[PDB]
Design an enzyme around this catalytic site. Structure first.
Site, mmCIF file in Angstrom:
data_model
loop_
_atom_site.group_PDB
_atom_site.id
_atom_site.type_symbol
_atom_site.label_atom_id
_atom_site.label_comp_id
_atom_site.label_asym_id
_atom_site.label_seq_id
_atom_site.Cartn_x
_atom_site.Cartn_y
_atom_site.Cartn_z
ATOM 1 N N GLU A 174 2.425 -0.891 6.426
ATOM 2 C CA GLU A 174 2.869 -1.226 5.095
ATOM 3 C C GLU A 174 2.791 -0.007 4.278
ATOM 4 O OE1 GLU A 174 4.346 -4.069 3.909
ATOM 5 O OE2 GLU A 174 4.663 -2.528 2.348
ATOM 6 N N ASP A 175 3.674 0.930 4.538
ATOM 7 C CA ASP A 175 3.837 2.053 3.623
ATOM 8 C C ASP A 175 2.589 2.914 3.451
ATOM 9 O OD1 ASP A 175 6.369 0.784 3.155
ATOM 10 O OD2 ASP A 175 5.585 -0.282 1.385
ATOM 11 N N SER A 176 1.851 3.170 4.524
ATOM 12 C CA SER A 176 0.710 4.090 4.465
ATOM 13 C C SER A 176 0.808 5.052 5.618
ATOM 14 C CB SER A 176 -0.641 3.375 4.492
ATOM 15 O OG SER A 176 -1.211 3.345 3.195
ATOM 16 N N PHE A 185 0.770 -1.250 0.000
ATOM 17 C CA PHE A 185 0.000 0.000 0.000
ATOM 18 C C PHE A 185 0.816 1.323 0.000
ATOM 19 C CE2 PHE A 185 -1.824 -3.330 2.679
ATOM 20 C CZ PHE A 185 -3.000 -3.619 2.030
#
Ligand SMILES: [Mg+2]
Ligand SMILES: [Zn+2]
Ligand SMILES: [Zn+2]
Ligand SMILES: [Zn+2]
Ligand SMILES: [Zn+2]
Lengths: 49, 528, 98, 73, 46, 40, 490, 117, 275, 67
Positions: free
Chosen positions: G204-206, B159
């Site tokens: 996760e990369d947010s 994401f």
């Protein structure tokens, strides 16, 4: 008269070079633009080295 | 030419007959959503309203469907079209009195998707069969596909703005077939390498080991809150591990509720801790670091990647073989929910603090670096005198290059081992490495201790210039810094040579990543 | 028109003597953000076979120190074939040897 | 079925037939009626590609040749 | 009803209410601007 | 004014150097490479 | 060498190299060599002296300049072939140290080491505490961070433009940015950021974001798309015309409403348009009579080819310009303005290439607060740091903390003696915070403190062109390719 | 815009219903309360008031997903004292305790300050 | 009910902008929720509808509408007289559920003009103006006391628009905030170990931790609970601090009372296992 | 362009304090102290006003005494 040569913006032959910040601001052309790019058919066209 | 149109990519066979673009599809950005099951996916209302599914009218569902026709199209849970048995298809926007269009058994009604239709969800490039799986939609606000975080792993989604493709099957035969075969709960253990293809990850993975530690105690009030999230709770609150002075539940105890009272894993424990091969057996202080599950209750030891993760012998794998996919399904959702909420009171973080150490450690490391550098000068002095004596299976140049590399690697490893030891228990950095969440020992070495010898093509920095690597060095300098050793660490900054030499080695990683995607894509294709 | 054509399209030559040898030498100036414009005017490009040539003209050679930016390439496809000058860099316009 | 340039509405004679471009369907204002032999300016289909390599345009299947200045093309 | 057509850089209207050339009289510029409508538009401050 | 004789303290705090560097960009364009070639 | 420094040989255009092991001297005066300026050191000392520096400061009223400086022959331009032969020293410091060091033979000296960096690698703070591929990733994302890109953007009609409402100059700057006019025209915002796990919507990369901040205008931006349309005679018996198309006369009948248009043939500034509205009504009178015999009725004399809005759900018409183009034809540009508010799915990045999607947004109520009550504007997940090792992300942040309290802009120059870890932490404690940035955080849902202290503080963040509403997409039936009979490209 | 109108975060619909009560089946004398269009603000305090009461065996609440404003409260009491009465008492007592806080606050405000206006 | 404490209050400091106080013998959940109410649930009046007649500034239209929304409004008048727009019998808007604002300015002089809240006037009687220069010349001068530069204009540029302010609250949009901020703290000595300090000496003692002037740093107590909450609410200027807190408490009281009346209505019909 | 009314982070109105800040720095060089006298006690607010850039002035500068 032999042809029309495209001018690269704000080089010594593009008429904007001889003017100061207030004059370019008066011409509605941004003083902080870097120039050096051709304008063809409404598009600014830049060469890659 | 006619042959060319037929040829290869974007040719009549391969780029068109064998792979055509399809109708009934949706595509958007993804974001994580702990609150979904595993085999659920959240779908934006706009995407759910625009796409359609054809239900055929029966005598016992006609009244609901007639209501659906009546809602029209202007509001969400409506219908797009109605198809007459005659073959006529009718729009439900133009007709001024839908009520006058009475339904009857045999008409098909194309209604908007609603909470519970099954879709194929997909991320290209589709590397293996588990990269394309069936899910239940869940309609919610704002415009991305939302999918449970544990599904990231088979898909390789991060994401960070990755896309997904969604496909909606139309008949009942394709819905049954997807539901039975392609569904995510069916996808849990992979036939490629008989292991669970999805394990607990990221925060849930860090938050669980921290939660299972036997130092954690919860008051009656906080135990109720966790119990509240759990789905399959029996309704009986378990007997607290401490009765008095005040009632307390241990971390492992509340965790024993989230696993299906049946799984029976022994071993799987291998964190660094305890010891390597025989220390705990030296009389057996039980374990403090080895996991034991009996009768579906976590008896002792904390959880990690070794117990809880994708490893073929896990809680998730043993549960899957034992309880069956639907129970493993509720177990995955439950483990994250109880563990995310507990994390919610606890917190997890990482500042510069987790990367800095003590004064004595730096003096020891610098003294380690000074010894290694002196030894390299010692090898060079021995080498120039022509007394080095080549190793039996190399030339003199190769022996020197092997020998300095052995020493400079040996140096990094000693200082690296020294920092991991000098660190304490509270370093959040150690909590992320140890759970098996992200990073590694060598990562810790690099931020705090020392970055080490950069590399290209398997050897030290090349002489780009005549007998030099940068113009800043003297000619023919075979020491450490000049051939591209980085003496400092990412916590203390790098010197200009190191920054540039580090940049050479970072690039080799970018070129490998760009090339690799093409050849694997091609080798895979030839095999199938 | 012969110059106007070349600058507009991006092609090379008057079209009669090929065009593929100097494809994409001309571009529409990106302007997404002032740094973007300023970066495109400082772009440097490096010719290749076009589709998968892996070799040394793609990585970071040591002579780039101070000429070309060490860390600033596209993240895919042309992952080292597109370079940028550093800041102090210059390019000699040339002169009579006489 | 040689008479339909767009009067093919079986239930009642047509006055106007509307094109719901997004749905790919031909609809009739005052009943329900699709009769979708979907022309979507079929002219649009060659101009579909864009993001794939072009400029030189390898996928071109016809030069304009300017016919309205020439008897032959 | 007229269509105004505010001129390039003098901004005296043009009353361009016909097929006539879009050149603004008096002022040599020939780029235009249609002017904001008298039609009201609502904006929530949100 | 400089004389290379009465001078006794040639050192100077290289944090001064941005004044040299600024005079580079202040004189040169930020993108002379383009401009000088077309002028040539 | 003496002549070139004396200006008798054109310095910038002439390189001169001696290769002594082959006893040859080559000189080049050709165009296309890359060369850089360097200081000339002689007798193991700088040739540039403090007298010149005071002369350079004097230029506020003096005509003395960089060209004068080169003519003093204290700097030379050195190309890569010549750079192979020099003995270049990193700093005047090392050149002094030489009394104990190994080398005492320097000829040139670096005017400063961060200059080895190009434009985008120069916007980014502390780049050396970054693991090297992070610096490449930012330089890419830096071109995608939207901002106010020239100042005269109100009178430009760029095909597509993105402008941020409230840029801010980077609280922690690199010295180099003073010459990119970056302070004049910024790229992102100085946000209040916390590295916490929170309710884990940011794995996760947010990122978890403060909804009241997006509401107070934070990262709010405007978007302009410009449509152009031409009338054109384009043939002997074809005419194109701007008009209000009617189903009584025109041939196109596209169900899109034509009611919003002006009598002229294109809508006027201020009108709201949507994903169906027609912006310009152009028509193409074509056969004229070549259907001979009462083939008039309606929809005959001319076809429709007007330009509408498939594009998107869009916004308000900003400007409409009628003029004429290079050919002489009547020509239009119409600009449509939209206001993008940051929402789940949009993409952002800090200057370390910590790019990420927005996972959910919470109102000021929920965000975890401090003693004051400073609720974070963004929460980045801690796991983004350790594998990726952008420690520079934390250093920028800690430095930005000191800048906010001192009120003095900091300095993220990548090569200095500012012993950044110890020295900053000492300053930050003196202001009365935990010396290494942590702050005792409280939980928004239950008021209880968070048991671990959260590293919290400001950091410059970027909003990207990749908004989520632009990339969303779906299909059901729709257009068919009759040369192929399958759906369209996208 | 796909996003909802902002008022939709709290405003009840004409067809929806403000509270619903359903009994459990797993254990005796237990109940589950669902409140629609609400947040942690109501839920968290009421959960705490029920825990304070010694006749409550279990009491807790959660919101199932943040994008769909709804909360559920599970309460369980001894088999002689209904969870409905405890829920009623906990609220009424809380209103009373807040009112005492409200009364005591205004009086505290009065005392010594001529700048309260 | 036997378990309700005896929620006491003590006010430390009060000014035009601050209210600093301690609540004691109450629950943490009461403390957190009362705080959540101060931000989200306190109603206020703010500009909510803007229509622009002519806008020639060097700033685009929605940009202006946005800046207008965020200006605070002196709602010293009981906003309870003004009902919510949703409930009122009127079509769209009216004096009974709205306040009306109007702005008309042009730059006729050669020098640059500033647009501020003094030029923006309430058509509605002077009881609900903008925050700048109303109840006081104020001896603490804010040099210009301009509240906000709405925009700037030059010779020939002009701005004419209308605005309609309405009652709404913070959990809807941030403009409806009665608070610039709110400080909140409990147990400043960490007696309860709800947070766990590694190396406890590097933490700076807080303004309330001084009770233990001792450098010993945090004496432990295992039989403790939360007690004595420290608040410091600061107004944005839209409403006096004590009046915000009192309105919050009462509004929350209306909110629970509503839940009781709904709950009673549920047992008005079928008993639904009430006993 | 032009100060955001109210600081993004907290809520404290911060346009009321802008011109006074610029005025005070022109008169008195002590920017840390200038922020303090203005009353922005806290660093979220201090970055707001501190790191803002007044771009509006270049825009007012254009010829546009017409639009
Ligand atoms: Mg990924
Ligand atoms: Zn019909
Ligand atoms: Zn004119
Ligand atoms: Zn009313
Ligand atoms: Zn603030």
């Amino acid at each position: 008269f032999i042809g029309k040569i495209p001018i690269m913006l704000r080089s010594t032959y593009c008429l904007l070079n001889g003017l100061t910040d207030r004059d370019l601001c008066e011409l509605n052309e941004c003083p902080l633009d870097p120039g050096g790019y051709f304008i063809i058919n409404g598009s600014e066209k830049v060469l890659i080295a | 030419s006619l042959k060319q149109r037929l040829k290869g990519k974007e040719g009549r066979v391969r780029g068109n007959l064998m792979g055509k673009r399809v109708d009934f599809s949706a595509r958007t950005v993804i974001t994580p959503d702990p609150n979904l099951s595993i085999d659920q996916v959240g779908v934006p209302r706009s995407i759910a309203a625009n796409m359609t599914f054809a239900e055929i009218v029966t005598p016992f569902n006609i009244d609901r469907l007639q209501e659906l026709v009546r809602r029209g199209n202007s509001q969400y849970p409506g219908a797009k079209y109605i198809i007459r048995d005659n073959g006529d298809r009718i729009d439900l926007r133009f007709h001024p009195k839908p009520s006058d269009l009475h339904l009857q058994t045999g008409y098909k009604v194309e209604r908007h998707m609603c909470d519970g239709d099954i879709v194929i969800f997909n991320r290209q490039p589709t590397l293996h069969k588990m990269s394309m799986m069936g899910h239940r939609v869940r309609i919610l606000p704002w415009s991305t596909f939302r999918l449970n975080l544990s599904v990231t792993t088979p898909y390789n989604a991060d994401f960070d703005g990755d896309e997904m493709n969604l496909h909606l099957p139309q008949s009942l035969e394709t819905r049954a077939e997807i539901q039975e075969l392609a569904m995510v709960p069916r996808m849990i253990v992979t036939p490629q390498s008989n292991r669970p293809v999805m394990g607990i990850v990221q925060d849930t993975l860090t938050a669980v080991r921290k939660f299972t530690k036997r130092d954690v105690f919860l008051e009656r009030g906080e135990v109720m809150n966790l119990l509240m999230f759990l789905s399959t709770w029996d309704g009986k609150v378990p007997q607290p591990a401490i009765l008095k002075p005040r009632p307390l539940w241990t971390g492992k105890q509340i965790f024993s509720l989230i696993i299906p009272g049946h799984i029976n894993c022994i071993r799987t424990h291998s964190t660094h801790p305890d010891d390597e091969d025989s220390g705990p057996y030296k009389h057996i202080s039980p374990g403090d670091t080895k996991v034991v599950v009996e009768n579906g209750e976590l008896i002792m030891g904390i959880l990690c990647k070794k117990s809880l993760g994708t490893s073929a012998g896990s809680l998730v794998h043993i549960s899957y073989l034992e309880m069956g996919h639907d129970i493993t399904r509720l177990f995955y959702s439950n483990i994250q929910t109880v563990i995310n909420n507990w994390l919610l009171i606890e917190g997890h973080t990482i500042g510069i603090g987790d990367s800095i150490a003590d004064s004595k450690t730096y003096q020891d490391i610098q003294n380690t670096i000074k010894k290694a550098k002196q030894d390299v000068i010692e090898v060079i002095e021995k080498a120039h005198n022509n007394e080095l004596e080549p190793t039996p299976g190399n030339t003199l140049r190769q022996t020197f290059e092997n020998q300095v590399n052995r020493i400079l690697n040996d140096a990094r490893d000693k200082t690296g081992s020294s920092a991991q030891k000098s660190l304490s228990e509270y370093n959040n950095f150690k909590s992320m490495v140890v759970s098996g969440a992200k990073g590694s020992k060598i990562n810790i070495s690099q931020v705090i201790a020392v970055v080490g010898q950069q590399n290209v093509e398997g050897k030290r920095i090349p002489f780009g210039f005549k007998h030099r690597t940068l113009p800043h060095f003297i000619k023919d300098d075979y020491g450490p810094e000049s051939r591209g050793f980085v003496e400092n660490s990412y916590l203390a900054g790098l010197t200009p040579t190191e920054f540039f030499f580090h940049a050479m080695g970072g690039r080799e990683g970018l070129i490998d990543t760009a090339v690799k995607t093409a050849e694997t894509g091609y080798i895979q294709r030839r095999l199938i | 028109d012969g110059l106007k054509y070349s600058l507009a399209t991006g092609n090379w030559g008057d079209q009669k003597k090929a065009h593929q040898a100097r494809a994409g030498v001309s571009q529409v100036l990106n302007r997404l953000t002032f740094a973007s414009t300023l970066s495109h005017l400082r772009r440097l490009n490096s010719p290749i076979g076009r589709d998968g040539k892996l070799a040394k003209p793609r990585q970071l050679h040591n002579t780039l120190w101070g000429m070309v930016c060490p860390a600033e390439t596209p993240e895919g496809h042309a992952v080292g074939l597109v370079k940028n000058l550093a800041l102090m860099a210059y390019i000699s316009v040339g002169s009579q040897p006489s | 079925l040689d008479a339909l340039p767009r009067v093919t509405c079986p239930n009642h004679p047509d006055a106007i037939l509307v094109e719901d471009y997004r749905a790919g369907d031909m609809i009739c204002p005052e009943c329900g009626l699709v009769v979708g032999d979907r022309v979507i300016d079929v002219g649009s289909e060659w101009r579909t590609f864009s993001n794939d390599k072009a400029t030189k345009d390898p996928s071109r299947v016809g030069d304009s040749q300017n016919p309205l200045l020439s008897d032959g093309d | 009803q007229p269509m105004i057509y505010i001129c390039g850089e003098c901004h005296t209207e043009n009353e361009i209410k016909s097929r006539d050339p879009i050149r603004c009289r008096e002022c040599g510029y020939r780029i235009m601007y249609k002017k904001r409508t008298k039609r009201l538009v609502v904006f929530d401050a949100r | 004014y400089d004389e290379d004789d009465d001078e006794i303290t040639p050192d100077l705090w290289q944090e001064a150097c941005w004044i040299v560097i600024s005079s580079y960009f202040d004189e040169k364009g930020l993108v002379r490479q383009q401009l000088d070639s077309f002028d040539e | 060498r003496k002549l070139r420094r004396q200006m008798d040989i054109i310095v910038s255009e002439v390189s001169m190299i001696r290769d002594i092991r082959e006893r040859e001297i080559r000189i080049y005066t050709d165009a296309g060599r890359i060369c850089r300026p360097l200081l000339i050191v002689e007798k193991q000392k700088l040739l540039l002296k403090k007298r010149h520096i005071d002369q350079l400061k004097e230029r506020e009223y003096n005509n003395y300049s960089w060209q004068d400086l080169v003519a003093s022959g204290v700097v030379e331009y050195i190309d890569t072939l010549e750079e192979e032969t020099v003995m270049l020293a990193m700093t005047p410091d090392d050149l002094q140290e030489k009394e104990v060091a190994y080398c005492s033979t320097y000829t040139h000296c670096e005017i400063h080491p961060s200059m080895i960096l190009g434009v985008c690698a120069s916007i980014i703070p502390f780049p050396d505490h970054n693991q090297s591929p992070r610096n490449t990733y930012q330089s890419a994302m830096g071109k995608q961070a939207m901002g106010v890109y020239i100042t005269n953007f109100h009178v430009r009609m760029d095909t597509l433009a993105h402008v941020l409402y409230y840029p801010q100059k980077p609280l922690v700057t690199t010295r180099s940015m003073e010459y990119l006019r970056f302070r004049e025209l910024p790229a992102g915002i100085n946000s209040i950021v916390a590295i916490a796990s929170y309710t884990g919507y940011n794995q996760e990369d947010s990122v978890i974001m403060n909804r009241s901040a997006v509401d107070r205008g934070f990262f709010r931006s405007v978007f302009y798309r410009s449509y152009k349309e031409q009338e054109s005679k384009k043939g002997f018996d074809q005419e194109e015309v701007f008009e209000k198309p009617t189903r009584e006369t025109c041939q196109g009948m596209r169900h899109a409403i034509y009611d919003k248009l002006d009598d002229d043939g294109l809508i006027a500034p201020g009108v709201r348009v949507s994903g169906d509205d027609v912006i310009i009504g152009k028509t193409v009178t074509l056969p004229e009579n070549e259907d001979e015999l009462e083939s008039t009725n309606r929809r005959y004399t001319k076809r429709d080819c007007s330009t509408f809005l498939r594009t998107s759900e869009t916004g308000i018409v900003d400007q409409v310009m009628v003029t004429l183009n290079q050919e002489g034809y009547k020509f239009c540009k119409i600009r449509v303005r939209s206001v993008r508010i940051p929402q789940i799915g949009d993409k952002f990045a800090s200057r370390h290439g910590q790019k990420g999607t927005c996972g959910i947004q919470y109102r000021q109520e929920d965000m975890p607060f401090t003693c004051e009550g400073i609720t974070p504007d963004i929460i980045i997940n801690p796991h983004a740091i350790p594998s990726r090792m952008t420690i520079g992300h934390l250093i920028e942040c800690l430095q930005g903390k000191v800048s906010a309290n001192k009120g003095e802009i900091g300095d993220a120059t990548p090569f200095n003696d500012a012993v950044n870890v110890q020295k900053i932490s000492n300053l930050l404690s003196d202001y009365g915070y935990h010396l290494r940035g942590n702050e005792v955080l409280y939980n928004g849902f239950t008021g209880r403190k968070i048991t671990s202290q959260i590293f919290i503080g400001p950091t410059y963040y970027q909003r990207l062109k990749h908004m989520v509403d632009d990339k969303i997409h779906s299909r059901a039936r729709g257009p068919i390719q009759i040369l192929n009979r399958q759906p369209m490209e996208g | 815009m796909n996003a909802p109108p902002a008022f939709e975060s709290f405003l009840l619909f004409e067809g929806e219903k403000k509270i619903t009560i359903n009994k459990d089946t797993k254990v005796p004398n237990a109940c589950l309360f669902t409140i629609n269009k609400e947040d942690h603000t109501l839920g968290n305090i009421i959960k705490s008031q029920l825990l304070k009461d010694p006749q409550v065996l279990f009491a807790g609440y959660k919101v199932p997903h943040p994008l769909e404003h709804k909360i559920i409260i599970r309460v369980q009491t001894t088999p002689d004292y209904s969870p409905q009465e405890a829920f009623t008492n906990a609220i009424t007592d809380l209103i009373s305790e807040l009112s005492l806080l409200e009364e005591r606050f205004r009086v505290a405000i009065k005392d010594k300050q001529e700048g309260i206006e | 009910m036997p378990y309700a404490n005896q929620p006491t209050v003590r006010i430390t400091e009060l000014t035009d902008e601050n209210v600093k106080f301690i609540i004691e013998n109450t629950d943490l959940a009461v403390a957190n929720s009362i705080r959540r109410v101060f931000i989200a649930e306190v109603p206020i009046i703010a500009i909510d509808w803007v229509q622009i007649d002519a806008n020639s500034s060097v700033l685009h239209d929605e940009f202006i509408a946005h800046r207008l929304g965020l200006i605070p409004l002196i709602s010293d008048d009981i906003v309870d007289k003004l009902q919510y727009s949703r409930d009122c019998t009127c079509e769209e808007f009216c004096p009974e559920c709205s306040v009306e604002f109007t702005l008309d300015v042009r730059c006729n002089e050669d020098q640059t003009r500033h647009v501020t809240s003094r030029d923006l006037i309430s058509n509605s009687p002077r009881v609900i103006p903008v925050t700048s220069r109303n109840r006081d010349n104020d001896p603490n001068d804010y040099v210009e006391q301009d509240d906000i530069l709405i925009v700037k204009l030059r010779k020939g540029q002009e701005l004419r628009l209308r605005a309609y302010a309405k009652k709404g609250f913070g959990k809807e949009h941030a403009k409806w905030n009665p608070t610039a901020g709110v400080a909140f703290e409990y147990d400043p000595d960490n007696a309860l170990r709800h947070t766990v300090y590694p190396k406890p000496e590097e933490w700076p003692k807080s303004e309330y931790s001084e009770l233990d002037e001792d450098e010993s740093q945090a004496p432990y107590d295992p039989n403790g609970k939360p007690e004595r909450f420290y608040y410091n609410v600061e107004s944005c200027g839209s409403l006096r601090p004590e009046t915000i807190v009192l309105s919050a408490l009462s509004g929350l009281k209306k909110k629970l009372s509503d839940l009781q009346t709904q709950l009673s209505h549920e047992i008005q019909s079928d008993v639904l296992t009430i006993n | 362009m032009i100060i955001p009314v109210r600081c993004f982070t907290c809520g404290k109105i911060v346009g009321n304090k802008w011109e006074a800040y610029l005025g005070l720095l022109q008169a008195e060089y002590t920017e840390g102290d200038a922020l303090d006298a203005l009353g922005l006690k806290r660093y979220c607010c201090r970055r707001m006003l501190l790191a803002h850039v007044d771009l509006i002035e270049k825009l007012l500068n254009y010829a546009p005494l017409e639009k």
